[model samples]
Structure formats: C-alpha cells, structure tokens
Target chain A: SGFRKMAFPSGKVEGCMVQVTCGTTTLNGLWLDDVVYCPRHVICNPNYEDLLIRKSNHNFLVQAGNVQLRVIGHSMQNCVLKLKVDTANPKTPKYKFVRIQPGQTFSVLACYNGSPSGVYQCAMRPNFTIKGSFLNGSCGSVGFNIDYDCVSFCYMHHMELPTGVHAGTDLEGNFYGPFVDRQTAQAAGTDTTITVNVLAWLYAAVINGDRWFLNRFTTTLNDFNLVAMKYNYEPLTQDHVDILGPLSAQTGIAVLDMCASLKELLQNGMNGRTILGSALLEDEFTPFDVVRQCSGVTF
Target chain B: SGFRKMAFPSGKVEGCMVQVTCGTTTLNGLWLDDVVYCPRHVICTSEDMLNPNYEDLLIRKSNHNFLVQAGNVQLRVIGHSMQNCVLKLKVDTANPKTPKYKFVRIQPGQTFSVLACYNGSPSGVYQCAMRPNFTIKGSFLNGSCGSVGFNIDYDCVSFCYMHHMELPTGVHAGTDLEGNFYGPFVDRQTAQAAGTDTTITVNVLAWLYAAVINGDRWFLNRFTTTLNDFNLVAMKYNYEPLTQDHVDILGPLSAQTGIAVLDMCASLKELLQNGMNGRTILGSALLEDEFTPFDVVRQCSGVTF
Candidate 1:
C-alpha cells in the first residue's frame, strides 16, 4: 500500500510513441517496428541476442499480448501520452481528463481482457487549467495549457483483488472495488473499478481530494485497469511519446534525467549483483512473483 | 509473497551484530551479550571488549537474559520473531523439532515495533513443554534447538498496527475487527496476542496435513523487506563485534594464493602479451565489505548458508 512518488528530472528531449493492442496472441509479432524507427517496440535485435538490455526495457513497456505503449517527456515538470489500438475499424472516441499538477507525475493503468484491440490517447497540459476552470465549448480546449513540457514516462502495475489479514470481502469476493465512484470520489465504496484498497485510497485522496482513504487499488477483478484509464473518454487528446528506448536522452531533462539515472543505477546494480534475475521481469501490466493464468489465455 | 534464498560459500564464520531500528522513529542499538554478563548493561562496544574471547569463540561471559521456559532454538526463534507474545509457548518447545523452521523474513505491513526490554531474571521456572514429540519436563533444553552460537545475543520486532490505513472507529480502531489485514501478524483481541495469519493460512492449506502441528512459527513476508530488516538488526549487532576488536582477529581469515592457472593451451600470441596482477589478492573475511558487523549476527545465527 506504500506508493513512492518518483519525480521527473530536468532536461528536455523528444520521444516516439508505441501503440498497445489487446488482440489475438502471437509470439513474433509482438514487436511492431524496426529498431531505427521504433527501437522501443523492437523485441528482437538483428542478432537475436540474449542479454539483459532487451529484457530490462521489455519489463517497463506496457503491453497486452500485441498491445504496446510508448512514453515521452520534454522536461521535468510535464510530458505527454498516446496509444494505438489494433482494431479492425477503430471508433472515434470521446474523452474526459483529470488535470495533472506541475510537480506531480500521473500514471495510467490500462486493464483489458478482450479480443480485437482498443487504443486511447491522453495528454498532459501544464498550467493547463485550474481545477473547475470553465471551458468555451463542450469538446473544445479552453483553459487547458499543453505548452509547458511534461515528464515523459511513468511506471505501470496491475491491480489485484484485495487479499490480506483484515481484508474486507465484497459480494463479488473481491477485497476492494475498482475505480472511485464519482459521487463519493474519496469514500470507501465509491471506487468499484479498483481492487487494491491502497491504490484506490491514494487515487481518491490525491485526485479526488478525499482525506480519509485506505486500501491498495487493484483491477485483477475489473476490465478497465491500465495507465490509459486516465484517458477513458478522450483517447487522442494528449501526446504519447515512447521514452523506453534511449538510455542517454535523459541527461538534459531534469525529471526524465532523474528517472533515467535511477533506472540506470538500479538496473546496473541489480544486474551486476544478480540481486534480481531475468525471471523477475515480465510483460504483464501487473507484476507478481506468482500469478494465476486464466484457463484459455496463451502466451 | 516472493522469497529470496541466498547460499554463501563459507559454512562457518563470525562477526558483530549491528542494526538501525525502524519505526515512526529510528533507534540504533547493539544487542550485546545479555544483561547478566554485563549487568551495568550499557549497549556500547567499548564495554564488550572488556570480556575475553572464549576459545576463539568470543564470549563476554554474560548472564542469560530472562530465562524463558523454552529450548534455545525456540527461544532464538521467538527472539527473531517480530511478534513478542507466543500464543501457546508450552506446546512447542522441543528441539530437532518435527519441523525445524525459521521465519527469516517478513513483508512491508509486518514491521515489528519493540515493546519491552529487560535483562533481569523472572521469578518463574522458564519451562515450556513442546509438541509433535511432547517432552513434559518444560525445561529450556526440552524446548526447541536454541542458538548457542549466537550466544545470548538476540533481537526481535513485533507488529502492532498499520499507521496509514483507515480504522473503523472506537473499539474497532486498529483492532482486527474489520478490513483485510495485509501485514505479517494481526492482534488477536481474545488471545490478547499477535497471531500469524499468513502462517495459519499456509499451515491450514499444506503443513497441517503433515500432522505435525507447530504454532511456533514466524510469518514470512517480502524478501526485500526481510533483507532490509535483517540488515538493520545485524547493523545494531555489529557494534558488539567491532568493539571486541574481533575485526583484527577475523580480518586475516580472508587470504589469497599467489598463483594463477589458465587454460594451458592459451593462444601463444596472448601468452606473450602479459600476466594479470597477482599481488592485489582478496582474502578471507578480512576482505573489505566482506565481514560487516551485520554478517556477524547472521553468521552466528546460522542465517548465512
């Protein structure tokens, strides 16, 4: 239930985007493009080499079988986000947004268990608008500001049903519900879409301004868990950049630099010391040492 | 729920115990030999150095702390346990226990808060009968295999309540009356003791069927959390060994041989280039960063494989 807020580094750089698609399972096609153009999505190197470099980045890439996402950042305070779903005929979607503050880094948790892919987009507009700021048109941008750069990337983890000593069981046998209910945003039973009590508690507290919140938020029970959840309505309104590939791009950007330095230090220390091995790394948005695989789902 | 098990090459080694106690506030202490040996009991290193090393086995010749009616192993296990009160102390005090296990780790929510510290002896006979192979005498030996190697040096942390979570108000406040508890142990109001819920779950699912019941268990939590906790405890214990100047003695154990062997048929071209430096050799536990004070407690407790 302890969430560590990782701050972005100072410095600026451009990033690319990698779309995530939840569809038919296939092994080789998971990587959508070549290294030069979309190195973040390139699963296999030209040599088909076996090393830690590829595995390290793979664990951070938000993927659902064929689904993939690219993170981007221009400076430390803010960045952008976007997604490309692999659907036959994608439907034009509506959007809703939660304003991201200058110092805070927003994370998206995209959860899906379906066929045919679905992609959504969301952007970070800094100095964008004061909360409750009025808009000129129903679908038009008014008070939102996208000029200031936002942090490029954020980490992702899946939410699971509550399971612990004092866990409260719901009719669904889930420990906590998913998504905070709009009416009672920070109230206990408001978030039905989130499973982990702690996360739900945090989202409600930070986003909804609910003071008394507890429990880790999880989506192991719900279908709407993902980093893209922040963009549930507005899929393409924000910029999505893939910040996973380039290790050196973080030098100038303060927020991105901090992340890059931490990642580099952590990955190197873990790898050199063998503190954690390849087996700990995985492709799922949710990570656990032991996971229960659904009966019909195949790698 | 993930566990990490590491195996070291050395079967036996020793050093000091050192740790930075964690809580809402941190307290640093060196778990020296019990209060009996050093009755004045100032948990400082300089005082420990006064005691002579017994047979290369450093012994400050201290008095045993509160004689618990349990075996050394059970006593040590209880010592390591974060939860202070044992529900059924007399039931499982036998050594070579039908199931000899150690609760070497715990998770985030399982942080143990220290409740009491005493060195004086209690009035009652420290006897507790153990189970599986019940020995009625209830003597210390009759309990479980106690840690002699660790001397009387022992430390434990007990979990009481979760700080950041919501409470149900009144009597239910911080009690196990409602909400799912995610920590290592939850307080049992009826028993007036902390119980290992995770252990209970695991035992009910698997160990219970073995027909070898043992409530003398510690809840295993996250590998990282446990590692950090142990590191903290060991750090506190480190002051003991460091003060003993045992560093001077154990430092030499780590040594290196002067010869290097390579594939004999190495490329002739490579052989002529040069040989690697042999003088800069690492040896024994003396190797810097090799034998820390924490490693001492871990080694003594048989924590290191």
Candidate 2:
C-alpha cells in the first residue's frame, strides 16, 4: 500500500490528523482519536458515523424509471440508517423514508410513474446528526438531484460541480452521455447545471405551494436549457463560455429570489393554495418535456 | 264781343284765365274780371309764341315739301295739296327729302284761333296772320281751333300760354316757365332751401343742352317728366322746391344716368358760356359731328333775324 502524508492548512481542520486507506489508495486528514479509520475506505471518524453521510465521488444515476440516491456510511459497525425521499409533491412522493445498514453502500430508489423532471431531495436521518446528513442535519436536508432522463447531483451549499460521468435518459427514453462520447457528456454535464437550477426553483415552489415559483421555474428550465443546448454542441470560444457560464448562476438566483418571495407570500397567506393539481401547475411543468429534449438528454 | 270774368285765386297769372274770339264765336272764362259767361268757342291762354322766320320756313313745288322753323320748333309738311289750300295737321318727317303730310279740308271764312306756340329759332320776335295762299301765310300756328286755315299768319296780342309745353324738337325738347322742363326748378329751390343747388346749376344746364342737341328723346323725356312729376308731387305734398343737386340724389334717377347727365350738362354749359373758347367740350361734342344740333341752337340764340 502506498501511504502518503498530508498536511492541513491553518484552521482547515478542527481535529487531529489521521490516515485512511481504501484498497491501494490513502487519504490523510484531521481525525479525532476516538474515531476509527476504515481499512476498506477513507474514514475520518467512526464514532461520528451517523454524521458521515457525505456524498461519494461516484455519480448518482436515475435510470430504468427510478431515481437512485447514493451516500457513503462511515460507521465502524453495522447500524440502521433512515433515508427520507422528497419531491415536488411531497404528499404523493414515492418514498417517505427508507432504512439502510451503516458501513454499507446505501441506495434508495424513488420510482416515478411518468417521465420525471424537477427537484428531489433525499435526506439520511439519525446521523451526526450526520456529517453527510442533509444541511449537515441541522435542517435534516442534504442535497437535491434533478432527474429527467438523467440524474444531476446538487448540493444545498454548492452551486457548481465537476462534469459527472453518467449516461442520461430523456423523456423519450433514449440514453446518452459519456457512454456516447466525451463531448456529449461534457455538453450533457453543462445542461445538468441549468436543470438543477430549474428544479431548485421548482422545489421552492413545492415547499411554498406558490404558483409564481412554479411558473418561473418552468420558464427557466425550458428557456435556459433550450438556449444552452442550442450552443452546447457548437464549438464555443472562451468568451462565449465565460459569458454563458454566469447566466446559469444569474438565472438560478433570479428563480431563487422569486421562490423566496413566493415563499414569504405563502407564509403570510397573501398567496393562494398550492398549484399541485391546478392547470397552471400542469402548464408550467409541461415545458420540461421540451427542455429534456433540447438538453439532449436521451429518452 | 262777349265778355266774361276770371279770377286769379293765387295771383298766378299763367294758369288763371284765358279768352279768345274766332269769327262769330267768342271764348270766355279768361276775362280780366271775375264772372261766368259761356261761349261757342274755347278760350285758351297763350303766353308764348312760335314766330316763323320766312328764311327758315319754305314751301316746295310738291305740296308735301314744307319746312318751317318757329320759335325753337322745326317742322316739315308733306302731302298732295288740294287746289293749293292746306290746313294744319301732322306729317311724317321720316324721309328728309320726301315727307308725308296730313291735312284737313279748308273752307272759306273759317277763322282759326291759335292756342299757343313755341318761339324756336334765330328770331326772338313773334308774328301771326290769316290768309288763303299757303306760302303768303308765311307760318302755321298750332292751336285748339274753332275753325280751319290754309296756312295762315295772324297778328295777335299777348295771350297767356301754359308754361310747360311738349314740343317737337327731338322728343325731349320742351318749354317750361321756369327753365324747369329740362331740369326741375322746384329741385333747385329745394336744393337752395338745403343750400346746395347753386353748386349744380351749370351742371344741370349742360345736361339739358346735351339732351336737346343730341336729339335724345329718351333722355329728354326722362329728365323733363321726372322734373314735372317731382314738382307736381311736391306741390301736392307742399314740399320745398328741388334743385339739380337734389335730382342727383333723388331715387327715381339711376346713378349712371345722373352722373352722365351731370357731366354732359356741365360740359354744354361750359361750351355755351365760353362760346367756342374751350376745346375740351367742343372736341368731345364735335366727335362724329354730334355737335351740329347744339351748334345750330347756339347760332340761333346769338343772332336774331
């Protein structure tokens, strides 16, 4: 085994350093003395295994009409962990909660009846109040994934991600991504950011039950993703990339702000009921079909 | 002689009374005193005379050719003579050389009484006579008659004549007592009453002369009748006498006629008063020989025969 020493910058870590090995790889970082480092994988602290539900480097996949949410469990012994699946329609969500054993690679399947697009939040409970728990277990919320024909992982705290390597399916059920080509994967990866933002707004709309958020969310999903895909396949210069790059964040914040305002309105009872069964809700969500196609996701 | 009485109610002798005797008939109602007496003949006053100058009066061999100028009157007698005797009647002077004449059969001892006549010529004197021969009578007089004549000239004394008379000099030439036949006399008095008639006296005289010389019967009748009517109306209304200036403003006359008359009257008056000394009026009146009639009148008025 090749072991390498690593140093932490000042104030980078709050605990003592430790070494972890997973097969032929090693990870060295801050470790508390009371925590165990697993030999099969990097484990900073085992006593706080309930808190260690951090996202794995492995990309999540939504395939075969099912959404698979993955999380690493850092417990020294087998322990039961609960997972909560949340979607735009929480009352009709596919899964309320599921249990998995600790120190086991856990996967929760939330199957949708039709082609699904928008935001799904999965939280692992009874962890570190887990380090890998959603919102660090402070809010019992971890992260969301936009699953159309593809699954794109997003964080509650992070707005950007490296290109993920997973083939994605579109509403038509065709598969495409890194499996097709690097270029296609890169383009699809870029499309995922826009989709995630769309879903983010959609999630806010669902949480607040506001039609305003729903409308803005769908508009951003369809228009922005369509615009991005139109240019995604083309050879673009740095200037174009730089120009197009900020638009995602800009649009994301705009949708976010709209939802935030909508949420406030709902809380104040200034707005009407949730749009879950409303024609307006259906109309807003309908653009996701075209957005999936324009995003070049496989059916 | 039968005598009758007459009265001048208003001290106007012109129209007060008249008397006359023609042979066995004697006319009345024109006596010097007030009385009533009827007679077989009519007595008409004669205040004017139309004296014929033999030089201006002529008798050609044809019974139709007779030219007579009396007072301001001129006449041509035309027709076939019945045994060298002719009575007073009108004739057509349509042809200057050959005129057609009319006559009444003449009977002997039929004394003709001349009512009134016009003095129209180069002579200011008057004369009259009775005769059988037409030429020796020298002139014929127009009158309301008790009998007929074969061209006669009679010696008669003064008799009152109507002041206004319609004469045959052109159609407009006429006699007036106050020189008002050509322009209204009452108008001048009215104008004078208003104190503006004097400014137009010469203008009025010039218009009258133009009318007379031009033989413009339409203008003459219009001017003369308008004046007479105004006077009669004024008298009836007891209005003030009118003047030429008043005539200029009167409603009966058109502005065009008034101004034209005024200009012509002024021009003729100037020419007469100046006696061929001014060319402006002479030149204007002489154009196209239109000045002949006026020139004849001028020469007649200046030299008496």
Candidate 3:
C-alpha cells in the first residue's frame, strides 16, 4: 500500500495507465480519439496470463482474467459497487451501501465472476474476494490509479488470499472473517472486507498522523483472534481445529483426495473427455438465486 | 546457477592448443576456457548510440589498453579518454596476392604497425576519419609502415589507406556494418572516365571480405568502367557470385546475404510468369569459385575465411 505516484508512458505503449477519467473511460483511456488511432492498449498485462500460473505462491491481491481494463472511473456519482466475498457462504448478499457523500469513499466485497466490459473471471468455488473501494471526489483524479490491480494474485493457481496467506475461514477465524456484527449502516452482518482494514490503517497512519495508533484488532480477525480472544472456545473449539494441523491423518487424507481429483481432472482434459461449455458463473452484478441452485440442508 | 569451469581433456590431448598465449598474456576472466564456451571471433569495436563516452565498458586484453588482432592487425592504444580512436590492418589488395584493415582506433600515446602500398619509399601519409561523412578527424600515420613486396595474384593500382576514398555522389556501396569502411581508392567513375583499368588490387585487411556482387566488393580500382554490359556487368564483374560458395552452406551469415539477392530474383521471375498467364510469353530475358588465398598468403596473415 505504498500508494506512491504512478506514471504511464505514451498511448501506444504496452504498460499500464496511471490515471483514468469518466470522459476518457472508453477504450485506451488516453483520449476518446486514442481508441481509433492507437494500435496497442495501455493495459496492466497481468504478470501471468489469466491464471496460467507458473508459480503457486502468488496473490498480488489483484484479480486477473483474460480481459484488460482501460478506464477505472473515479466518480462516486453512480454510487454502485457490487462486491461480496464469494467464499463458502451460501447466503445472498442483501447488504446495501448507504448513500455515499461527496468527499468520502465506500468499500465492499463481492465475487469476481467475469466481465466483457473490462475482462475478469473466477470459477468453481469463489476463490477470490472482489473488494471494491470507491474514493468519490477525494480519491485523486479517478478513483484509484487505473493501474490498481483488481484481483491481484494473477499467477493462475492463486493459493494465497488477499490477506496474503491461506484462505481466511468463515468463523472470523483468520482475516477470512464471516463476522456478523453489521448492525451499522456501513457494514453487512457477516462481511469480510480487507479494504476496510486497509483504509482505516492508511487513514490513521497517514491522514490522522497518529504516531501510536492502538489498532491491531481494527484490521484483521487473525490479529483479533490471536490478540484479544486467545482462549475463546466460542467460535472454533481446540478439538475441531486439531484435525487441520500438521500430521493429522484426516488432513493427509484430504490432501491425497485433492491430489487424486486434480490428476483425474487433468487426465480427462488431456484425453478430450470433458465437455466444453460456456463460463460457469456470470459477473456478481446481476442477481441470481444461490440456495435454489444448491437446494440446501432444509430442502 | 551451476557455475563451474568445465575442463575439456579431449582438447588438451588433441592438436587444439587448449590455451591462447599472445606472448604470455592472460585470458583469465576473459572467458577463454579449455573449450566449450570459447569463441573463435572477437568483438573488435564497441560503441553505443546514446552514450558515446562509455569507453571503459570493455573487457580489454589486460589491465592497460588492449591490442586488437585480426588479419594483418598490429596497433596499440592508451586508455586515457579514448573515445573514437582507431588503428587498423587491411588485406593487401595490391602486389601481394597474399594477406589483409588491420584498424586500431587509438588514443594519443600508442604504437602502431601495418602493411600497405608498393612504392617502398621510406615515408607514409596520414589521414583518417569516421568514414561516415569523414566528419570526425585525426592525423597520425608514421612513416615506418612498410609494404610487403609485389606478387601476381594482385597488381599494384597505387593504393594506400591515407586517401579517404568514398562512394561517388549517388554511387553508393559498402555496408555500414563497419564504423569506418576505408577501402582506399580515389573515385571509381572519375578514374574510369580518365580511363583506368579495372582491378581490385588495393591493400586492405578486410579487402572486401564482406563484398559480393550483392554488394560486398568495394571497387578498389574498377576505373575502366567496363560495366553496364546489361546485368552481366554486375554478374561478371564479381568473379565469385554467391558469397563463400565453398562454405556458406554452413555459415548462415553468408546464407542470409545470398537469400536477399536470390529472393529478389525469384520474386521477379514468379511475377513475370503470373503476368504472362494473363497476356503471353512476350519475350526472352533474365539470368545469374569460392575457393582460396590459392588464399594461402591471406590465410596465413589473419584472413580467417
């Protein structure tokens, strides 16, 4: 988050654009005329193409799909952000963002399915968090710099999460919080938005100029669990947690099963047995029934 | 990084001298190992378009300024502020059928040696330039530089490196692959107008080593201008047509050079046939050694090819 100034080269160059505007939100984002004349787009060509992952440990915290974006609009006037953690949770995200003011920004999490407008995608289980942090009039020229990587970890097989490690879980276990205290207008009851932690930390250290901000619990539940509730057995008991640790026979069995399934899928793909079809999920913007597709436990 | 100097015991036992010793000099960090990574060609010149002052970017022969040797090359230089200094050796295109710009771009304090010309008069002329537009200048050629007598393979057309021979206006030749392409001779057309015979008997290290009918031969003394005999002039003028007919099938540098010429001709023929398909077979037209210092004299004195 060393949000220093970023620079973009000429319009015909291959790198990323540093800024974008509502007017220039067309194709190349330089000028409206740039769309017709230019040969190449100034795209943040994700380090690895659409998760053709060469390495396992990459999660630059930005989403990457086969598509590229030109203008990332800054105006909060539209006031529409469709973000929710596409984690294991089955509940629909009915959370609403309050009417945002002029100088303020809002943050939320969603699942990145796919997009034709800019090009983004995620498949199977929601492996990535679609965190959209909107900085209305005060967020520099156009929201964040156009170079801000959306779903950061582009190295295809992103084994890491936005919090920079393994998947944060549903019980507010790690920073992967399904925390349920959104009695306030700004947050959902069980929202896990690292954007909030990141922004608050940035505001305190930078804007507030606080030298000693006692804010460990303000950012992540990983810190909250390890710091405040060291002995709390309410969320996850020791007996339930021990099965996930090192050398657990059950964990070893799970790993073997995962490896077997991966091998089976790859073999099927190579032998041309698996059928090709349209993408699995659409972008999270359009509403769809989650539990009706699942036919959950009550059903 | 599996970094280690792998020794070649085979090269050690074979006739190939596993070490290069230019009078006990060192190739220590110079990548001259026993065999595998050793290269036969040396990078003679260094310059960048942007920065003209990065002279120390070279891994010279040793700590002091380096001695560059190719065919017939023997020149020296000092390292102090040496920008575009040069010393050269050339293949003798004159009397000596044998041997080659022996050039060394030298700074102030340096020694030099090279062979040129037939008039064994104990004196020499000095004139040098960047050879592009002859803009960058320097005057330093000592008199002791002597000639290696006459031979039949090449006749003496009165040549020397001192005279800045250039392409006559609109009569362009020679590739700029070289920084200073000093193929010495006064203007060819003027000499031809004044009625001089055609012979490439000029002394140069690289005496058109790269020259071909496809444009490697720098006209040393093509003065009589027996050219323009249709396309036959360009064809017959150069004795050996397809560069290194002896070897190029192995060396691709020559192959690439030959490919351009062949491609141009082949394209024309194909186009003519296609045109005839519409109209008719209108008319008749069109056409088109590579061995030795026989190449011994040259082969001995620095001319590797």
Candidate 4:
C-alpha cells in the first residue's frame, strides 16, 4: 500500500509512513501503520480505506469562492479589494468587493462561490497605498487548492522608486522580507509610502474547522472580522451588518451600494426603487435608471 | 622589529585588505592596499614610532565607557537617535519631581537636558482619549540633551497594544515592530488604535523643541520644525500646523506647571496667541480662573467635534 502526497518545493509529511503488501480484496479488516510518501509535499489520510491507490495522479484543484479581501496601509484606509477569476480575462468580478482599513490589516474571504478548482485573483482599484519606503500601483494575486485541507499563499510585485532604482534584489524580485529595514537600521529609514495589493483564495474542499491550514487560511478571516468589528461594519460573527463607518456609508455612494447588497430580502428587480430598496427616499438614487422599465416594473 | 596581522570575521584578507590603525599617534598616512592578513581573526598594526603602547591603552579606555548600566532600547529614526539614560525618578506634585524623557538616547555627542521624562513617576500627568480602543493615563517626563548626535541615539519605548484581547487572543501584548495595527494578510485583521501615550509624547516633544530646544539649539527654529523632525516622536515631516487638523492639547494645572520646564524660552507665550497655527494648540488655556497664571496652567482644551 502506498500513500498520497502533494508535491511541492516546501512542505512536510506526518503520520505512519507505511507500504502496501498484497493485492486488493473485498477488504474486511485492514490496518497497517499505513502511509506513502511521494515527492509531492501534498498529504492525504491513510484512514480512507477506499482511497488505497499506489499513487495520486491529480492536479491539486483549488475551488473558487468568496473570501473577504482588505487593503490596509495609509492612503488605502478607505479603498476596496476586488476579486477577479483569472488576470488573463478579468471581465467578471469575483463575489464582492471589500474595503481597506487604515494603519491596519484589512481582510475578506471567498464567501459567495465555493469550488476551489481554478486560479482565482484578488485585486483593488488603483487608489489605496501600501505602507513602506516606496509607492506602487498594481494588482496582487494568490492561489489556493480546494481540498479537505485548506492553505493560504501570497505574492507581491515591487515597484520602481522615483529615483528609478528597482525595488528588488536578485533572490526576491519584488517581495521583500519583513526585516529589510532592520539591516539598514543605521542609515536613513526608508519612508516612502508603499501599497500592498492583498488577495486570498479559499478552497471549498478545505473544511472551515481544520486547525493546521485553518490557522493560516483563517488569518485573512480574522483580518476581515476585525475591520468589520471596528467600523461596526459587521460583527465578528455572521448575521450582522455595521459595514464601513457611519460617515462612509452615508457619504460614499459606492460604499452604500455595497451595503445595499447585504439586504438579503430585497426584491430582485433591477429597477430604480427596486435596485435601491427604498427607491423614493435616498438622494442620488440612480438605480435601474440606466435600464428601461421592463414589463413587471410597476412604479 | 615585530609585525602584526588582522583578519575579519566574514571576509578573506590575502596580504592586501583595508585596515585602520587607532592609537595616540594618528595613522594618518595609509594607502588602500596597505593591510596584512592572518587566517584567524586578529588585529595587527605597526607600533607608532612616537608611542608603542597607545593602541592597547585606547582600547581599555573605550571599554570602560561600555559598562552595563540599566538596560534600555535605543530608538533610531530619521535625523535622531535616543536611549533612556535615567531609569527611575519621581515627578509627583506633592513630592519633589524630575521629568524623565531623559532616558532617551540621542546622538552620542549632542548636549540637551531632559525637558520632561515621566513614564513611571508620580508628579508627571498627561492624558487623552484620542486612542480609538483603550484609554491610557500615565506620567511622562521631559528632558533634553545638547549637540547629541542627531541620528545615532534617539529611540522610543516599544509600542504596546492597549486592547489586549478582543475575543480569541487574550490580553494584547507589545508588538515586535513599532507603529500602529498589524496584519493586512492575516484572516483576523486587527487594526490597533494609535496609542494616546505616543501622541502625547509627540505633542510634548514638539512643544519642547519649539519653545526650548530651538532657541537654546538655534533661534528662529520654529516649534513645528523641531516637533516635526524629532526622531523619538516619529512625527511625520509635515509642515502643516496643528491648527489645520483636529488634534487638541490638554493638561491639569499641576501637570502644566510640571512641564513648564519644557517651555525653555517661554514659547508657550507666543503659542497662546496662534489660534490659527497649524492644527495643534496647547491645553494650558483650560486652566480654571483660580488656577490661571499659576505656574501650572492647562491650555488648548477643546473637542475635535
């Protein structure tokens, strides 16, 4: 008997390292401190008696779903995180857009769709800023595999400084270690404002409760919860909608639009009053105005 | 007739390497390729013709000043560095007081007095609820040093989160890095409110520089420039006045009098007039009529709303 493993450059294995002895049988009672180790760092449970295969010839599939995304930095305090399926074709947005918090970490998770199969993308409008010694404007993308086990990954691109020096080294082209400032502790502290486009992917196959991957996978969960908690945006737990801050909701039309999405019971007509729930009350109520009144629109 | 060799821990020295010979007689004349090498780490410089034992003696002297006093974190920021010098002191009004910012480290050679240093003392008083999460109240001392190396020594106490535990991680602890909030990537993103204490320190240091360190260090050095540039406070280099924004300054009469030492040139006298100055103003005006003109007077007490 062999074991299952996801191959990767960085990872480890655990549990009984075992091998198969005989041919298959209408299995009655079988137990060996059974496990298989493959070059792939991926891990599968030997507990599954039905999954006794010599090898797992499968591409780790990552399901696509909604996770809250947050852009946190100085100027990005009020920006939004946009999710795109594939950078190659970004016509369709992910589930929803999340807002960024200031001087803090903002986070959102895939909440709408769940399949964790293909490449998913998270990006933000070109308004927010990253906190660092440089400024950058670009989308950040990450990938995840949809398995019973959940994991998280991050990717960053460095931007050129005004002085034209590329913000990269040979080993890490754009992603800088969190400790670069410590090395140049003696000289001028790098004070340039930088933006970090943060995106996270969640695989549906990955259970919400798995602690190992959950810890990393859920960091983004906590970030989103924390930001929502602060602005009374939403409670740490589900079924609440404080959403952004009061001023942001009232003044920012775009922000208000997102809030409108939280109303679960709203009628599904794309008309003006139908789009904005209370059609006659709010100012700048431009809902359904762009489209003509179809047959069923009454008012 | 003896020769010496010096080897660096992480570098190879094939007969020719860069070297510096320190002794009573300066090794003024040396070329880039004039160094000797040993496989093991060692220092070898020719004995000065005028004095033979100077290098050994100088090392001994430098080591003397390196004795461990109280342990303190040395903060290094733009244009200044600070380390805590005086570890403990009393600043309560009923008791004799000595303000404590003195513990800060600045460049080695600069000379300035601690205008006020009161992190752990009694006489000192500064409080503000501007912090979004938790309310902080404590005594902060003030002191100054002169001509100190601006960039070498200015440091600040590590910033600690006020709200320790939100729901899961109980009792927030200090951060490994400085500044506000943590985690843009973590699922549970936590935005830390700016510590009222740091904001207070910035305000106090700015006022001290504009009023005291400026004239003493240089005339016409406005409080804004001094306040904005001091490294320990980490005040961003914004020329805008405190009046432009909604930051308020406040203090009790006793605390005001306690920090008066920070008003070196009586800069507050002029500061009292500028209702239009940047967005920041002193709280000394808040003193009760009875407490007015008292050595301790709180001013600039108002709400941002």
Q: Write the per-residue lDDT of candidate 3 for residues A39-133, one digit (tens) a residue.
A: 01111223213322222211111121333333222111111111111222121112211221111221111111211111111111122222221
The regions of model 1 sitting more than 4 angstroms off are A1-258, A262-273, A276-299, B1-44, B50-305
Backbone clash numbers for all candidates listed: 117, 50, 55, 123
- Candidate 1 chain A, which ten residues in sequence have the lowest lDDT sum? A289-298
Lowest lDDT 10-residue stretch of candidate 3 chain B: B1-10
Compared with the true structure, the alpha-carbon lDDT of candidate 1 equals: 0.19
- Against the native complex, each candidate's DockQ, computed on alpha carbons, is 0.01, 0.00, 0.01, 0.01
TM-score of 4: 0.18
Clashes of 2: 50
Where does candidate 4 stray beyond 4 Å? Answer: A1-151, A157-160, A163-299, B1-199, B203-305
- How high is each candidate's TM-score? 0.16, 0.14, 0.16, 0.18
lDDT of 2 by residue, A114-208 (tens): 11111111221111011121111011011222232222212111111122112221212122222221122132223212222223334333333
Q: B40-68 in candidate 3: lDDT tens per residue?
A: 11122223322322234434434233332
RMSD of 3: 33.4
- Candidate 1 vs 4: which has more TM-score: 4
* CAPRI quality level assigned to candidate 4 from its DockQ score: incorrect
Q: After superposition, how far is residue B273 of candidate 4 from its true place, in Å?
A: 8.2
Q: State the iRMSD of every prediction, in order shown.
A: 28.0, 77.3, 35.3, 31.9
